[PDB]
């Protein structure tokens, strides 16, 4: 094996959140090592976060991590336009991806 | 009113064909960048390639050539294979994003 072979610990859990509330999208990885975890909006193919840096200028978006295993993206003050698919990405070669859905009520 | 966002320079080639193994260059020129940042992504699988000065992908064939202060965000693709053919996007991290699509063809 490669001494570092990151993998997704679990699939992303779909989330439903009412308008104006906060939602959290969590991606759980194993053995991340020196690799980088990124969050993207699938519908608009927009880069949201990379590691602990928020890339989007959308100030409603933040990123937090616990032990480099849990990567939780938070979306403040949900708008109905936030509904859709979100992708969690690891910069392995080949890259790894999984998707979860944020539903807005 | 004028938001004074960045803007692309459209006077660049956007449909590029290289022979297999021949290095390819994708020219994205972004003016008035301000506090924004420019990224390259591979549209087929939504793979992040570069973000600002940093390279995200571990595929060492991808690098962004940009001198400090310049508007040129050239994506360099060394040793291309037919697998690399497809659409690549130069995106600006505005809300909502600004994007410019590029078609890259690798011929045998
Ligand atoms: C996560 O959620 C998505 C979307 O579902 C939406 O969010 C949930 C949290 C709930 O609140 C849902 O009420 C809400 O709509 C799921 O994706 C969806 O998958 C289904 C099939 O599993 C697709 O259903 C349709 O199936 C019929 C035939 O039965 C076809 O005719 C349709 O064309 C379509 O395929 C549905 O389109 C799809 N929705 C989206 C937006 O992609 C997803 O499965 C779920 N994931 C988990 C793990 O729960
Ligand atoms: C993008 O271009 C390709 C091919 O462009 C070739 O190279 C250019 C420099 C120019 O000289 C063109 O005339 C050349 O054809 C177009 O794709 C077709 O591609 C297939 C295989 O990929 C090839 O067999 C065909 O001959 C090409 N057809 C034509 C008319 O060139 C493609 O249509 C262009 N896409 C866009 C969006 O402009």
Return the residue matching tokens 């990123």: A63
Whose tokens are 């053995």? That residue is A31
Q: What is the CATH number of the domain that holds B5?
A: 2.60.40.10
Question: What's the total number of domains in chain B?
Answer: 1
Resolution in angstroms comes to 2.4
Per DSSP bridges, beta strands B24-26 and B38-42 are unpaired
Q: Round to whole Å and give the CA distance between A77 and A1.
A: 44
A95: left (phi > 0), else alpha (psi -120 to 50), else beta? beta
Determine the distance in angstroms separating the CA of B51 from the nearest CA of chain A, rounded to an integer. 8
Cβ of B94 less than 6 Å from ligand 2: no
The whole-angstrom separation of Cα B94 and Cα B36 is 7
Residue A73 is given by DSSP the state E
- Does the beta carbon of A16 sit less than 6 angstroms from any atom of ligand 1? yes
The third-level CATH classification (topology) of the domain covering A1-105 is Immunoglobulin-like (2.60.40)
Q: Which atom of ligand 1 is nearest to the CA of A103?
A: 7
Cα distance between residue A51 and residue B63, in whole Å:
19
Based on its alpha-carbon atoms, the radius of gyration of chain A, rounded to whole angstroms, reads 13
Query: In terms of residue numbers, what domain contains B24?
Result: 1-108
Work out whether strand B15-19 and strand B98-107 pair parallel, antiparallel, or are unpaired. parallel
Q: Do B89 and A89 touch (CB under 8 A)?
A: no
Fill in the DSSP letter of residue A57.
S
* B83: phi then psi, degrees, rounded to nearest 5: -60, -30
Query: Strand pairing of A84-90 and A70-75?
Result: unpaired
With a CB cutoff of 8 Å and minimum separation 6, the contacts of B95 are A56, A57, A58
Summary count for chain B: helices (H), strands (E): 0, 11
């Amino acid at each position: 094996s490669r001494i570092v072979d990151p993998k997704f610990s679990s699939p992303i859990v779909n989330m439903t959140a009412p308008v104006g509330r906060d939602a959290f999208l969590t991606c759980v990885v194993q053995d991340l090592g020196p690799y980088k975890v990124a969050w993207l909006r699938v519908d608009t193919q927009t880069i949201l976060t990379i590691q602990n840096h928020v890339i989007t200028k959308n100030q409603r978006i933040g990123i937090a991590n616990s032990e480099h295993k849990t990567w939780t993206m938070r979306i403040k003050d949900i708008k109905e336009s936030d509904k859709g698919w979100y992708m969690c990405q690891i910069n392995t070669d080949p890259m790894k991806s999984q998707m979860g859905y944020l539903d807005v009520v | 009113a004028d938001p004074l966002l960045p803007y692309f320079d459209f006077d660049v080639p956007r449909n590029l064909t290289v022979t297999v193994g021949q290095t390819g260059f994708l020219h994205c020129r972004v003016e008035r960048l301000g506090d924004k940042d420019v990224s390259w992504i591979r549209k087929r699988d939504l793979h992040i390639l570069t973000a600002g000065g940093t390279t995200y992908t571990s595929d060492q064939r991808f690098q962004v050539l940009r001198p400090d202060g310049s508007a040129n965000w050239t994506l360099q693709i060394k040793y291309p294979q037919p697998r690399d053919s497809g659409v690549y996007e130069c995106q600006i991290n505005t809300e909502p994003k600004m994007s410019l699509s590029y078609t890259f063809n690798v011929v045998e």
